[PDB]
Ligand binder design. Sequence first.
Ligand SMILES: [Pt+2]
Ligand SMILES: [Pt+2]
Length: 124
Amino acid sequence: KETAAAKFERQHMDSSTSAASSSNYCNQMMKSRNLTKDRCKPVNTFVHESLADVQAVCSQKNVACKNGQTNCYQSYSTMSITDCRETGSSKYPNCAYKTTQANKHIIVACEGNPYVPVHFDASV
Ligand SMILES: [Pt+2]
Ligand SMILES: [Pt+2]
């Protein structure tokens, strides 16, 4: 069974390259991370920093999470991210995404030991 920390890395970490070039990054990435298997996951963000940099967010700016828990943290620095958002015409099993590159702060929920990200809350 996938741990919460492992799911976070599968959904949100893309440390291999510093950006999204291809307009088909999201279609490709959403597929290879298993986020088009059963349904089209509508919105998902990928972070293009090192896992060490992202795990360090858990010792940065403590903030509330969207759900009201207080184990969220905002990255002090901006980070390279890609936003994947399903198109208006996307219908499973042919999932379609627009790919948008951005440099923004991330907000993640952290938990467990080691104390690492388990949810992507938002980018700011
Ligand atoms: Pt800022
Ligand atoms: Pt959770």
